[PDB]
């Protein structure tokens, strides 16, 4: 749906996030985990995790932010013609993971806070919205598939 220009904005921020992937993932992760305790409850490999200290301390977390950020970018860069990557994920998330669209949204949040937090100058409003647009988009499709599938309350 989103504009030539908007993709523009959405993309350059990416390239920046690409500078320190693991950092960001860790970031987003922690944000998410702190803000929506429910979300972490769902990762078996992480539940053990008690403090912010612990989190940033743990390497498997690290790796984890990585796994995610990667899939994420892959989609962005596709400027909406992201089907290739999304499908599998929607299935994965709906069928084993058990992740609520609410999470996608949740996560989505930490994402932009994180982005904001880490790029004061680079990310004013023009960027912020593009970014948000992009996200609901990811949100939209993954939602659809869910339906198809019988998920999505
Ligand atoms: C930004 C959106 C996200 C992306 C791109 C994403 C991507 C991925 C990828 C690529 C995998 C591993 C291969 C696979 O299972 O598909 C994965 C595994 C998983 N993800 Fe997601 N994820 C996202 C958000 C979330 C959220 C919000 C939760 C929890 C609410 C979550 C929980 C999990 C769990 C539990 C696993 C298996 C975790 C593990 O490997 O043990 N993901 N995710
Ligand atoms: O994830």
Swiss-Prot record:
O2 binds at residue 64. The keyword Heme applies. GO terms for cellular component: extracellular exosome; sarcoplasm. One of its GO terms (molecular function) is peroxidase activity. It is found in: Cytoplasm, Sarcoplasm. Keywords: Cytoplasm, Heme, Iron, Metal-binding, Muscle protein, Oxidoreductase, Oxygen transport, Phosphoprotein, Transport. The modification Phosphoserine is found at residue 3. Nitrite binds at residue 64. PANTHER family: MYOGLOBIN. Monomeric. This is Myoglobin. It comes from Physeter macrocephalus (Sperm whale).
């Amino acid at each position: 749906v989103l504009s030539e220009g908007e993709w523009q904005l959405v993309l350059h921020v990416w390239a920046k996030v690409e500078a320190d992937v693991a950092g960001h993932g860790q970031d987003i992760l922690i944000r998410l985990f702190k803000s929506h305790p429910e979300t972490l409850e769902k990762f078996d490999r992480f539940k053990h995790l008690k403090t912010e200290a612990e989190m940033k301390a743990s390497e498997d977390l690290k790796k984890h932010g990585v796994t995610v950020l990667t899939a994420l970018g892959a989609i962005l860069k596709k400027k909406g013609h992201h089907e290739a990557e999304l499908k599998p994920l929607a299935q994965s998330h709906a069928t084993k993971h058990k992740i609520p669209i609410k999470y996608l949204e949740f996560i989505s949040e930490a994402i932009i806070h994180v982005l904001h937090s880490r790029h004061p100058g680079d990310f004013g409003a023009d960027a912020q919205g593009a970014m948000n647009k992009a996200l609901e988009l990811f949100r939209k499709d993954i939602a659809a598939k869910y339906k198809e599938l019988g998920y999505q309350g």
